Each structure stands twice: as C-alpha cells, then as structure tokens.
Amino acid sequence: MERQLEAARYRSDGALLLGASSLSGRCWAGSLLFKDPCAAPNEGFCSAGVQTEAGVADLTWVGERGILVASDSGAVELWELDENETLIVSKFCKYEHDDIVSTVSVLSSGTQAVSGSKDICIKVWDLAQQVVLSSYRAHAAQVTCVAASPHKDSVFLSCSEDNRILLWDTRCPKPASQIGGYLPTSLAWHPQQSEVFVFGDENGTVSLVDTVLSSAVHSQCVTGLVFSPHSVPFLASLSEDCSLAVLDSSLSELFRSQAHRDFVRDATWSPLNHSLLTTVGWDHQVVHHVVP
Amino acid sequence: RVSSGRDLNCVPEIADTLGAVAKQGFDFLCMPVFHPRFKREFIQEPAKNRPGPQTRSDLLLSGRDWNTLIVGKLSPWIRPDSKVEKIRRNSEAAMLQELNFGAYLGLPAFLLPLNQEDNTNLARVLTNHIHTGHHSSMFWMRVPLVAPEDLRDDIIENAPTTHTEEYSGEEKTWMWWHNFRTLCDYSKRIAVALEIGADLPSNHVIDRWLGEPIKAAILPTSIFLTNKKGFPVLSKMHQRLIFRLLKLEVQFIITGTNHHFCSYLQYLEYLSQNRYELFAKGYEDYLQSPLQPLMDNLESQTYEVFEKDPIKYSQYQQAIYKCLLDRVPEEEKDTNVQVLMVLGAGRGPLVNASLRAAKQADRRIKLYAVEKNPNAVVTLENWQFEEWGSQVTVVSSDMREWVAPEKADIIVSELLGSFADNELSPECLDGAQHFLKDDGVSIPGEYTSFLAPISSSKLYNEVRACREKDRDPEAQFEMPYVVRLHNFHQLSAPQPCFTFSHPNRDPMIDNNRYCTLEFPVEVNTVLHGFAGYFETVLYQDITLSIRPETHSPGMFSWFPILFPIKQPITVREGQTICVRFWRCSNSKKVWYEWAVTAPVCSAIHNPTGRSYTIGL
Ligand SMILES: Nc1ncnc2c1ncn2[C@@H]1O[C@H](C[C@@H](N)CC[C@H](N)C(=O)O)[C@@H](O)[C@H]1O
C-alpha cells in the first residue's frame, strides 16, 4: 500500500475505509476496505482494495457500498463495492476540473455531491446521471474544503485561500453568502444543531460560529474537524503539528494524542463503540484512540 | 511551426506522461518537481524528520530530457508571503529547496505564480537564488491577464462584483509584475508567463503588456469554444490576441483537462499558418552602433547592403530625372550639359542612378564622383575604366576639402542616417556648398528627424547590459542605438525634431539645434526611451522616409534609432511627456543631448558628448 494515508471513514457496521496515496518516489498514485479495523494498515489482511490512476486528495462514503474520490487528475471518481464486497470497481470517471480536486462532500439526499478544486471552481454533481448540475466560480483562490449541510439538501459550506467562508443555498438566485483573520482550512457542521458550524485556520485556531467562541488548539494548520456521534458531541481536531485533540462544547481540550510522527490527515469515530476514535497519518500509522 | 508545451499538475510517472505528451505533438512539459500536495516541514518536530526520498530521482530522465523537455513548477502550497510566520519560514525553505532542485536538474525554465498583490518576500527568495552563482536558469512568472477576483461569478449575495469601470484597477495584474521585477532589479532571468482568461479585459489592459518580456502564453482548455463539428476553437477576440502573441514568437502553453488531446494543439497550428519583415527578421530588438561613414571607412559588404535597396535608388533616379527636365527644356537637350556631383559616391550606385536618370530624361550630363574612402575609390576607378569611361570623373577627396574645377548644377548625396543628420550630412554639404551654382539644386534638398516616446522593459534591459569594463558605468544609456524595434510600445505619435535644408542660403549658418517636444500620452505606461525616425525630400514630391506612418513602402535601409534614458519614468493616463533634444557641436565633434522634463525630470544625457560623439 502507499505510504501517505489520506482519509479514514467508518461506515454503519464498523468497516473501515482507507484512502492513501504515494506523495514521493517513482510512481505518484494512490489506493482505496477493512472489515477488521485492528488489522489495518496491513495489506495482507484486508477485505478489498484497488489502485486508481492518481493520488487521493479526499474521499467520502456514498451510502454503504459507494466511495466518492477526489483525484489529483482533476476527475471525480465514484467507486462501488460488488454484491460480495470483495472487489472495488469504478463506476464513472469524469474529468471536469482543471486542477487537483482537493475536497468532496456528499449532500443530504445521498444522490448529489459537491466538489472543490485548485482551479478555484466548485461543482455540484448528480451521482445518478454522472453529470455536473452546476459549476460555480465564487472564490478567488484554491478551494480548500467543502462540507455539505447534514440536513439541508441544497445548503453547503466552502472555504478557500481567498480568506472567504461562503454559506451556499442553491435555492437562491445568488447561492453564495460570505460569512464574517487567518485562512480557514477545515469546516465541520454541528450534527445536532442546524445553524451551527466550526472551522479551523492555518494558525491552529478552532472557532465556533453561529448564523463567536475560539480557542488555540494546535500549533500548526488545522487539517480536519470531526464531531463525535454522541448526544452531546465531542470535537476531534487534527493538524499538521502531528497531534490529535478532542474538544467539548466550549472548545476546551479534554484529550490529546501525539502518537503520530507525521501529519494527521483524518479521523473517524467508531459506530459500534462511541468512545473509540481512529486516526490516520502520513506516517502510515492507523491509531485507535480510547477517548475518556 | 508553433513551440508549444503542456502544463500538468498530475504526473503519476514521468516516463509515461512525457511520452504521451510528446506523442500529442507538444515540445515540452510543465510539471511539478515535488508532489503538489506533499507539504513539508522544516522547523518543527516530528514532521521535520520525515524520512525520504523527498521526490523522484533525477535518473528517471536523460540529461538532455531535463535540459530541453521539462519545465519545473513551484508547489502550490508554498506561500512565502503568508501573514503567519511559521508558514513563511517553511515556504522560504521549501522555495529554495525546489528552486535548487530545478537547478540541479538543469531545467530550462521554472514557473512561479503571481496571484496576489504582495509578493515582496517571494521576490527576495528568488533574488537570493539568482545571486547564488551565474547559472543559465530562466524563471517564468505566471501572472493572469485578469485577476481572479475580477473575473469571479457574481453569485455572492452579500458581496456583488463591481459593475463600474476602474481604469487603473483593471490594470492591477500588470502592477503585480511591475513591482515584482523592480524588486528583482530588472533581472534578465525573469520573464512573464501571461495567462489568458475566458473573458478578455479592455484593450488598454492588453496594451499594458506591450514591450514586456513575455516568453510564454498560457491557454486553459476551458477558454476554447466548440464548433458544430465538436472541435475546440477560439473567439475572434482571442484569435486577435493569439496573432499578436505570434509576432513576439512566444511559447504557447495548454493547461487544464480535456473537455472536448491534440485538438487544442492543431487549432494553434491552424491559426499560425493563416497570417521588409522578411529582411528585418533576425535583427529584431538587436542593438547596433550607428554607422559613422565620415569618421570611419565603411567595409565592402557594408556598401553591398546599402546597394541592395532598389526602392531607394529608383527614387534617386526619379528625383534626378525630374530635376534634369526642369533645368534643361526641350530645345537645348543637345547643347546643355548638366554638371552633377555625387558627393559620397561609395562604390557608385548613385553614379549609375544618374546615368539611368539622364537616359530616361534624354539629357546630357557631366559627372563628378567624389569619395573620401580610398578603398571605395578602388571600386569607382575600376568601374570608371571598364564601363563608365571619360563621362565620370572620380575625385578621391573629402567634399569639404575638394577644390572643384567647375561649379555644379546638381549635387547628389546619401549622407543620411536613421536620425536624418546623425551622419553629419549638414556639415559635409555646407563645406561642399561653395562650388554649387547660385541656382544649384541639392539632392536631397531637406530632411527632418522624428521622435516618439516608447515603452519597452525588454530594450531597457538590453541597453542596461551594455556596460563595459573601462568606461562610465552608465555610459551605455547616453548613446543612441540602431535597432529594429520590435517588442515595444509607442506611447505617442512621432513629432518632427530637427530640420535641415540645402542649399543653406542663410548667411549665419549654424547647425546647432534645440527642440522641445510635448507628447500627449493617453495610457498608463513606463517610459524607457525615444524612437528616432527621419524623412527627406529628394526633389519636389519624390521623398524617402522611415517614419512608420509615412514609411517608404518596400525600403530595407535604415532601421529606427533608439535614444534611451538612465531611469524608467512612470507616466499616467492623460499626462504629457516633454522631452528636450540638443544638437551640439564644436570644431571636432558633433553630439546629441537629451532630457525629460515632464511628468518628471531625468538627468541631461551625454553632456558635452562625454559618452557619445560623432567624428567630424
Ligand atoms: N565629407 C565626405 N566627403 C566625401 N565622402 C564622404 C564624406 N562623408 C561621407 N562620405 C562618403 O559617402 C558615403 C555614405 C554612404 N551612405 C553613401 C554610399 C553611396 N552613396 C550609396 O548610395 O550606396 C560613404 O562612402 C562616405 O565615405
């Protein structure tokens, strides 16, 4: 398997999805399922795997057998599991962006998704027809992250290196709305509250925004933010300082993990055990954390 | 023949990608030398101790493939001008790392972005890299014609795009480049990779890039239209821009993914096939020292180039033809012999131009071929013994010192330079004026020099490089150059400068001149120098000219002349450029002095002829 692990996503039953890519050496490509999460990242004891043409910048589940991939090739790929879940086959590969597709997120309906890319463009996809519904050029720099609304099918967030955080609503004639520092880097909706979301910046600051509370959590760029599936959610923050932090309702630090020796790229909570949290990094480490 | 390259940000394997790009018809490939997403840490642990290798090996390509086929790209995560200090420190170390690796591979060019206003620290890290050894490395600054903020969709509800014209605002990306290259002090290793967008800006924005060192034009696939057949094409306005970029012989770069792969390439080759200049190609923006045929003796082949101009000599023959009829009517064609004196005959094309002029005019003439260059006299006297005969009298003397046996009806000369009088034609004809009859005709009878303010950061950098070892370090700015002006921008219509007439019947002959010219400038630009042309009246309506608006169609002789200035001068739209020119002379030398007095003042250039004199 490739060295640099990029994404880790648990599904319903507890299977772990891994997205990796080789960011050095001769060949620059990536790879894509572990029904035994403790067996990761060993390649010999996996359920399925496949090699794509280029690297994986971001991915996300599509239901229970679909994998939506953001590729370095500028294409959005959707991979699907067979009925036996032993093979990972490509469904379509649409080269619609002109640069690296850096972020992807599935809307609420599960039939539409949004992709951002370094071509400063944001596109809305229809996973059924394999076509691009709308193409928006609202930012003036690389689109860093897009995050669909958890419960509104036409609403999603986006941030770019133009220091803009845009709230979207494709039901309006002008769908983008700018939300009022340092460049934002990761976006995460609140799972239980509608008009509440969090974001981290390149300076290691996580902030709480309503439609403002902030705390200096990390010493480097905040790479991702994932809420816990509890009733009152925890906030897991991973950054380029190679540390993992778990925050509460008031953004206070409850847990801190420095197990990783390189950048921590993703984090996923276990659906079976709500206290277990799995993180991956560019050190090829899959660490399972027991959050108190 | 279009030199074209393919820009990519995704290269899974160099060997396979380079072959696929080459099989599509491209000549080179723009690729990153490190993985674009492989962000690296240089200061903080434990990420700074990341085990290698950091990128691909140099063994994956031959040395010649690195030298001629690969163009490196700065990683898009490197931001040396970040407001965060840690990101600056990492980006500085990373930028040097990728720059040094591109130099390690021996890459012909390297791409750096200009996508924001402040690139001061980006310019310093590049300036320190350039001043680390004298290596043949080129750097292409990727700057868009229209800023990304100025072409975004108007889809933000609470921040609508501007719908009113901002004249200088629409020129902001040129300001990004102008500031950047000024910080880098006009480095010859720094050029422009202009990026074309789907919607072109106003005409004055494209005109800003005239005279800029554009080595590449970047064409995204997303700007191409689609015909009925489904092939990519361009709008007529883009076609107009591609044709202008072809005159600069830029390298076109195709970026983005395939939306319709050699179709984009074949459309560029299609536009290239569908479009004086044959002789002037090769000398474009090549600085030359103006000839001084008086102080120096011209070589044989120098005369040979002068004579390969049939349009120039047919005008002289026609001028002599009309003057013979106007002086000898029909009833003395057998008894009236006109005394013609070719003052400066060279190898004798004007003597033959006089023979052909007397034949078609059916008049008798007596010729004197006066030449001071003794080597050219060898050509004249062999011409006179073999063909001309006793009709022509060769005189090996300076026309100012010659004691003529008789007086002439007509005197013919081609003592003009690119700036009319810069070869001292007035001084030579004045000294030759005493043996002209009281009703004598001088051909040419008058001539006038023209000047026009130009903008060309390219030519300014070329003059700047002409510094020599044992002379004033700024002497190269205080002397004119004969150059086929090419990549430049003429900011105002040329205006007449100095005028001389022959014969000068005035008793107080004085060839010293002082002229003040005010040029209306209707654009924002940067003044680097003044283009010089000339016009001359051989006889009545028979004229010669290198002034562009009235240029003699089909004449190869005389490229424009260039008067530079030491420091570039900023000129805003609506301002007037005022230049002052002096023609100075003593008993031994003639020279020009010039100064800018508006909108700001420059120094007086070449005072007392300290840097440039014309030998008398
Ligand atoms: N004071 C002078 N006396 C005699 N010859 C001169 C003088 N000044 C310049 N010349 C010559 O005039 C010529 C200048 C040439 N441009 C003309 C060449 C020739 N008339 C032609 O049409 O090709 C050179 O041969 C000079 O040597």
Short mmCIF file of C-alpha atoms in Angstrom, two decimals, chain B residues 273-538:
data_model
loop_
_atom_site.label_atom_id
_atom_site.label_comp_id
_atom_site.label_asym_id
_atom_site.label_seq_id
_atom_site.Cartn_x
_atom_site.Cartn_y
_atom_site.Cartn_z
CA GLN B 273 -0.40 29.04 -40.90
CA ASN B 274 -3.11 31.66 -41.58
CA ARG B 275 -1.48 35.10 -41.30
CA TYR B 276 10.61 44.24 -45.12
CA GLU B 277 9.58 41.84 -42.36
CA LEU B 278 11.41 39.05 -44.19
CA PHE B 279 14.63 41.09 -44.15
CA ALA B 280 14.14 42.62 -40.68
CA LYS B 281 13.56 39.23 -39.03
CA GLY B 282 16.65 38.23 -37.08
CA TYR B 283 17.67 41.79 -36.22
CA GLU B 284 14.55 42.28 -34.08
CA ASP B 285 15.49 44.19 -30.91
CA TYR B 286 19.19 43.74 -31.77
CA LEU B 287 21.10 46.82 -30.66
CA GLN B 288 23.67 48.14 -33.14
CA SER B 289 26.04 51.08 -33.10
CA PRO B 290 25.02 53.76 -35.63
CA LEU B 291 27.32 53.95 -38.63
CA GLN B 292 29.66 56.95 -38.90
CA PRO B 293 30.59 56.94 -42.61
CA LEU B 294 32.52 60.20 -42.15
CA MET B 295 34.84 59.28 -39.27
CA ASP B 296 35.16 55.63 -40.33
CA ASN B 297 35.70 53.96 -43.69
CA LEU B 298 32.87 51.53 -44.39
CA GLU B 299 33.80 47.97 -45.31
CA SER B 300 32.99 46.42 -48.68
CA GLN B 301 29.97 44.40 -47.55
CA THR B 302 28.57 47.42 -45.70
CA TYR B 303 28.28 49.11 -49.09
CA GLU B 304 26.81 45.90 -50.52
CA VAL B 305 23.86 46.03 -48.11
CA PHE B 306 23.22 49.69 -48.98
CA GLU B 307 23.05 48.84 -52.69
CA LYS B 308 20.52 46.01 -52.18
CA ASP B 309 17.70 48.56 -51.97
CA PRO B 310 16.05 49.07 -55.37
CA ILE B 311 13.30 51.30 -53.95
CA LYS B 312 15.87 53.72 -52.51
CA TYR B 313 17.81 54.22 -55.75
CA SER B 314 14.80 54.36 -58.07
CA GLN B 315 13.62 57.38 -56.06
CA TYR B 316 17.05 58.98 -56.50
CA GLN B 317 16.97 58.28 -60.24
CA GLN B 318 13.44 59.69 -60.46
CA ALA B 319 14.47 62.78 -58.49
CA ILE B 320 17.44 63.37 -60.79
CA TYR B 321 15.14 62.60 -63.74
CA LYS B 322 12.66 65.34 -62.83
CA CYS B 323 15.38 67.87 -61.97
CA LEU B 324 17.07 67.47 -65.36
CA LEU B 325 13.85 68.28 -67.24
CA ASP B 326 13.04 71.26 -65.01
CA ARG B 327 16.51 72.73 -65.70
CA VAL B 328 17.11 71.85 -69.37
CA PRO B 329 13.97 72.43 -71.51
CA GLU B 330 13.29 70.61 -74.77
CA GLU B 331 15.19 72.96 -77.11
CA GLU B 332 18.68 72.63 -75.55
CA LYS B 333 18.78 68.86 -74.94
CA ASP B 334 21.78 68.63 -77.30
CA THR B 335 23.70 71.76 -76.19
CA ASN B 336 23.09 71.95 -72.41
CA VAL B 337 25.24 69.58 -70.34
CA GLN B 338 24.40 69.46 -66.63
CA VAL B 339 27.20 69.14 -64.07
CA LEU B 340 26.24 66.51 -61.49
CA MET B 341 28.44 65.91 -58.44
CA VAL B 342 27.84 62.72 -56.45
CA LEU B 343 29.14 63.78 -53.02
CA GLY B 344 29.90 60.47 -51.35
CA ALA B 345 29.69 58.01 -54.23
CA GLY B 346 30.90 54.91 -52.39
CA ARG B 347 31.07 52.03 -54.85
CA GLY B 348 28.98 54.08 -57.28
CA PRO B 349 25.27 53.27 -57.35
CA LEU B 350 24.27 56.93 -57.44
CA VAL B 351 26.57 57.45 -60.41
CA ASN B 352 24.69 54.67 -62.21
CA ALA B 353 21.42 56.09 -60.86
CA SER B 354 22.46 59.32 -62.60
CA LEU B 355 23.26 57.51 -65.85
CA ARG B 356 19.85 55.83 -65.88
CA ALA B 357 18.28 59.17 -64.95
CA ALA B 358 19.89 61.05 -67.84
CA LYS B 359 18.93 58.31 -70.31
CA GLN B 360 15.21 58.26 -69.47
CA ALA B 361 15.32 62.08 -69.36
CA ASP B 362 17.29 62.27 -72.65
CA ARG B 363 19.70 64.93 -71.38
CA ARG B 364 23.48 65.30 -71.40
CA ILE B 365 25.34 65.37 -68.07
CA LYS B 366 28.91 65.57 -66.78
CA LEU B 367 29.57 63.59 -63.60
CA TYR B 368 31.96 64.01 -60.67
CA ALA B 369 32.20 61.05 -58.28
CA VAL B 370 33.60 62.47 -55.03
CA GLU B 371 34.50 59.90 -52.36
CA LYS B 372 36.91 60.11 -49.43
CA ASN B 373 37.06 56.38 -48.58
CA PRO B 374 40.12 55.29 -50.61
CA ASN B 375 39.02 51.64 -50.62
CA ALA B 376 35.71 52.52 -52.29
CA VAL B 377 37.61 54.69 -54.79
CA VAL B 378 39.27 51.46 -55.94
CA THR B 379 35.79 50.24 -56.87
CA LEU B 380 34.92 53.53 -58.59
CA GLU B 381 38.07 53.70 -60.72
CA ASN B 382 37.73 50.09 -61.88
CA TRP B 383 34.09 50.92 -62.63
CA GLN B 384 35.20 54.07 -64.46
CA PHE B 385 37.89 52.36 -66.56
CA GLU B 386 35.83 49.31 -67.52
CA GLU B 387 32.34 50.74 -68.07
CA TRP B 388 31.71 54.42 -67.26
CA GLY B 389 34.57 55.91 -69.25
CA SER B 390 35.54 59.56 -69.52
CA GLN B 391 31.99 60.73 -68.73
CA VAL B 392 32.58 60.28 -64.98
CA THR B 393 35.48 61.93 -63.12
CA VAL B 394 36.46 60.16 -59.90
CA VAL B 395 37.77 62.51 -57.20
CA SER B 396 39.46 60.89 -54.19
CA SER B 397 38.92 63.68 -51.68
CA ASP B 398 36.74 64.91 -48.84
CA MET B 399 33.92 67.04 -50.25
CA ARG B 400 34.75 69.74 -47.68
CA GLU B 401 38.40 70.00 -48.81
CA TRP B 402 37.94 69.42 -52.56
CA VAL B 403 38.84 72.27 -54.92
CA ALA B 404 36.40 71.75 -57.77
CA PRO B 405 37.46 72.64 -61.33
CA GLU B 406 33.96 73.99 -62.07
CA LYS B 407 30.63 74.55 -60.32
CA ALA B 408 27.79 72.03 -60.31
CA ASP B 409 24.15 72.36 -61.29
CA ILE B 410 23.05 69.43 -59.09
CA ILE B 411 24.78 67.73 -56.16
CA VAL B 412 23.61 64.26 -55.11
CA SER B 413 24.39 62.61 -51.79
CA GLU B 414 23.15 59.88 -49.44
CA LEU B 415 24.81 61.11 -46.24
CA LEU B 416 21.73 60.50 -44.09
CA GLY B 417 21.36 58.27 -41.05
CA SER B 418 18.43 56.75 -39.20
CA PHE B 419 18.08 60.07 -37.35
CA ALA B 420 18.49 62.10 -40.57
CA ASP B 421 21.51 64.22 -39.62
CA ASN B 422 23.29 61.77 -37.30
CA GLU B 423 25.91 61.08 -40.01
CA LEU B 424 26.80 64.80 -40.28
CA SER B 425 25.17 65.41 -43.65
CA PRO B 426 24.65 69.14 -42.83
CA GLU B 427 28.34 69.72 -42.11
CA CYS B 428 29.51 67.88 -45.24
CA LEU B 429 27.08 69.60 -47.61
CA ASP B 430 27.83 73.03 -46.11
CA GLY B 431 31.54 72.57 -46.79
CA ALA B 432 30.60 71.44 -50.30
CA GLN B 433 28.25 74.40 -50.86
CA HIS B 434 30.88 76.78 -52.24
CA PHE B 435 31.20 75.01 -55.61
CA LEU B 436 27.42 74.96 -56.17
CA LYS B 437 25.95 77.36 -58.72
CA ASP B 438 23.74 80.17 -57.45
CA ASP B 439 20.75 78.36 -58.97
CA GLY B 440 22.06 74.94 -57.96
CA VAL B 441 19.86 72.12 -56.69
CA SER B 442 20.84 69.86 -53.79
CA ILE B 443 19.50 66.30 -53.69
CA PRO B 444 18.32 65.82 -51.04
CA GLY B 445 17.03 69.36 -50.56
CA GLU B 446 15.85 68.89 -46.98
CA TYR B 447 15.37 66.27 -44.28
CA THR B 448 13.71 66.12 -40.87
CA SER B 449 14.22 63.85 -37.86
CA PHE B 450 11.29 62.49 -35.84
CA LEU B 451 10.99 61.31 -32.24
CA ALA B 452 8.42 59.26 -30.33
CA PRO B 453 8.41 58.07 -26.70
CA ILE B 454 8.47 54.28 -26.42
CA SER B 455 7.97 51.78 -23.62
CA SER B 456 9.97 48.56 -23.67
CA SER B 457 11.24 46.94 -20.47
CA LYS B 458 12.96 44.46 -22.79
CA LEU B 459 15.05 47.02 -24.70
CA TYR B 460 15.78 48.91 -21.48
CA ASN B 461 17.25 45.73 -20.01
CA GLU B 462 19.30 45.19 -23.17
CA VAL B 463 20.81 48.68 -23.12
CA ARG B 464 21.40 48.17 -19.39
CA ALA B 465 23.55 45.11 -20.17
CA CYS B 466 25.91 47.06 -22.47
CA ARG B 467 28.10 48.19 -19.55
CA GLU B 468 31.80 47.86 -20.38
CA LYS B 469 34.91 47.48 -18.25
CA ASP B 470 36.90 50.69 -18.69
CA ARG B 471 34.26 53.41 -19.10
CA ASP B 472 31.49 55.16 -17.18
CA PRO B 473 29.11 52.52 -15.74
CA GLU B 474 26.12 54.46 -17.14
CA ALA B 475 27.64 55.46 -20.49
CA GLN B 476 25.51 52.90 -22.35
CA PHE B 477 22.38 54.94 -21.55
CA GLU B 478 23.92 58.13 -23.02
CA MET B 479 24.30 56.95 -26.62
CA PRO B 480 21.87 56.04 -29.42
CA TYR B 481 21.46 52.58 -30.91
CA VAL B 482 20.26 51.48 -34.34
CA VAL B 483 17.77 48.70 -33.65
CA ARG B 484 14.87 47.08 -35.47
CA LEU B 485 12.30 47.97 -32.80
CA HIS B 486 10.03 45.00 -32.15
CA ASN B 487 8.76 44.21 -28.63
CA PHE B 488 7.94 47.80 -27.68
CA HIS B 489 5.04 50.20 -27.20
CA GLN B 490 4.92 53.58 -28.93
CA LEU B 491 3.17 55.89 -26.47
CA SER B 492 2.58 58.90 -28.74
CA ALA B 493 2.62 59.84 -32.40
CA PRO B 494 6.08 60.85 -33.70
CA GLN B 495 6.78 64.58 -33.95
CA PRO B 496 9.41 66.39 -36.04
CA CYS B 497 12.67 67.20 -34.27
CA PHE B 498 15.47 68.80 -36.31
CA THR B 499 15.14 70.07 -39.89
CA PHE B 500 17.94 70.96 -42.30
CA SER B 501 17.73 72.49 -45.77
CA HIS B 502 20.19 72.52 -48.68
CA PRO B 503 21.44 74.74 -50.05
CA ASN B 504 21.53 76.77 -46.81
CA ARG B 505 21.38 80.27 -48.31
CA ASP B 506 21.33 81.87 -44.86
CA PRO B 507 24.49 83.91 -44.15
CA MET B 508 24.68 82.81 -40.48
CA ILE B 509 24.97 79.05 -40.88
CA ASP B 510 24.57 77.29 -37.53
CA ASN B 511 23.81 73.57 -37.30
CA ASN B 512 23.30 73.67 -33.52
CA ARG B 513 19.71 72.86 -32.56
CA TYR B 514 17.45 72.86 -29.51
CA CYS B 515 13.93 71.44 -29.68
CA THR B 516 11.15 70.95 -27.14
CA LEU B 517 8.51 68.29 -27.85
CA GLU B 518 5.39 67.53 -25.81
CA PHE B 519 3.82 64.11 -26.35
CA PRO B 520 0.20 63.52 -25.26
CA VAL B 521 0.05 60.12 -23.54
CA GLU B 522 -3.41 58.54 -23.33
CA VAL B 523 -2.40 55.39 -21.40
CA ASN B 524 -0.61 54.28 -18.25
CA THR B 525 2.90 53.13 -19.12
CA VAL B 526 6.61 53.28 -18.25
CA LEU B 527 8.91 55.44 -20.38
CA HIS B 528 12.23 53.82 -21.29
CA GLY B 529 13.42 55.74 -24.35
CA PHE B 530 12.61 57.57 -27.56
CA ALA B 531 12.37 56.09 -31.06
CA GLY B 532 14.00 58.10 -33.83
CA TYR B 533 12.97 58.19 -37.50
CA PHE B 534 13.54 60.56 -40.40
CA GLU B 535 12.05 61.86 -43.62
CA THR B 536 13.83 63.51 -46.53
CA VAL B 537 12.75 65.37 -49.67
CA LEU B 538 14.96 64.35 -52.58
#
